[PDB]
């Protein structure tokens, strides 16, 4: 690589990658472990305009990488001694989409809705996220609005159900600020056909019954966007051979 390309890769590692790795290695959602990544620290890195990443891109790559809405669009034409690493472009666009959806205020925060679904052998369901409760009884579904994160002394998410043949059983109890994200990960997820900004969620309970819900988002994938951080790696280079 040229020394301009090389010193830019080195600046990228020292100014951004090393401290991202120190802050988020061996932490949920990056790794499926009990220890949680700090949401305010994650905001300090990926914030749309003030984030450490956005500031690095603006200070060092303003001539070859440009903003277009929530996207970063490359332009290495006329800079023939530079070819972007595709993993770099993909990583920054993944983080920009997460920031656009979940960090609009400069901190973690979004709103979404849930509607309890129906399934054979399921009489009642209870979903809780950050002390916000959705209790489904009498085959009477309602859309309920939720905040994530929500201020509470009990952060986390839980899911329980009453089958037609047994008393209440607990599906999962996931404490901490990422509780909702940990719960969503366990569901079978897909676009809900015929539901605007809708996603079907289906948790296979311990008795084999399906715990169904519809998620409705305000922008993009809503809270599902945070699942893009599962096994996410910030690349060590901006430019490649």
């Amino acid at each position, epitope marked *: 690589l040229t020394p301009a390309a090389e010193s830019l890769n080195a600046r990228w590692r020292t100014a951004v990658v090393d401290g991202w790795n120190n802050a988020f290695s061996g932490r949920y959602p990056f790794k499926n472990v009990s220890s949680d990544a700090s949401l305010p620290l994650l905001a300090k890195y990926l914030n749309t305009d003030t984030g450490r990443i956005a500031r690095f891109l603006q200070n060092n790559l303003s001539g070859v990488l440009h903003r277009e809405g929530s996207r970063w669009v490359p332009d290495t034409i006329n800079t023939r001694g530079l070819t972007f690493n595709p993993a770099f472009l993909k990583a920054i666009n993944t983080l920009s989409e997460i920031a656009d959806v979940a960090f609009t205020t400069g901190n973690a925060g979004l709103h979404f809705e849930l*509607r*309890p*679904g*129906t399934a054979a052998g399921v009489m009642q369901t209870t979903l809780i996220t950050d002390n916000q409760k959705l209790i489904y009884v009498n085959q009477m*579904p309602v859309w309920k609005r939720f905040t994530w994160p929500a201020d509470t002394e009990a952060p986390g998410a839980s899911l329980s159900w009453v089958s037609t043949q047994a008393g209440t059983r607990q599906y999962a109890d996931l404490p901490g600020s990422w509780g909702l994200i940990r719960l969503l990960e366990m569901a079978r997820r897909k676009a809900a056909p*015929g*539901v*605007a900004s809708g996603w*079907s969620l289906s948790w296979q309970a311990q008795d084999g019954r399906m715990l169904n819900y519809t998620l409705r988002t305000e922008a993009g994938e809503g809270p599902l966007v945070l699942l893009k951080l599962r096994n996410f790696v910030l690349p060590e280079t901006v430019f490649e051979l």
Partner: nanobody
Amino acid sequence: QVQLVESGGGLVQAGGSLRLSCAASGFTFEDYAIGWFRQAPGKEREGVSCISNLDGSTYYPDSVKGRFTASSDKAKNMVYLQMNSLKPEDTAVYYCAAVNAQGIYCTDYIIGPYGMDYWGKGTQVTVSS
């Protein structure tokens, strides 16, 4: 309060036709989608049709597609289910149900896991051979 009153049920010979009516009241008709569902003994309730008064979308599962037609009459606030070429598999209690049509379009998901907002009491349909 929403009211959904089904009528037109009864005994019909296999190969015959039957027209079901769902008299709707207590909601802004244009804002809702109406689903027809059926439940027979030893069977889970299943959706057979969806019609949205809001966008005009319709859905029918393959079991009844081409044989059953749902139509909406804004002048009378009624939804019909025209059932042709009736089979013994069509015997069940038929229910009409309503769901807010804002933000949706008729699909298998709507009359599947999504859930309805209001339900009628149902009408018996018996196909005799």
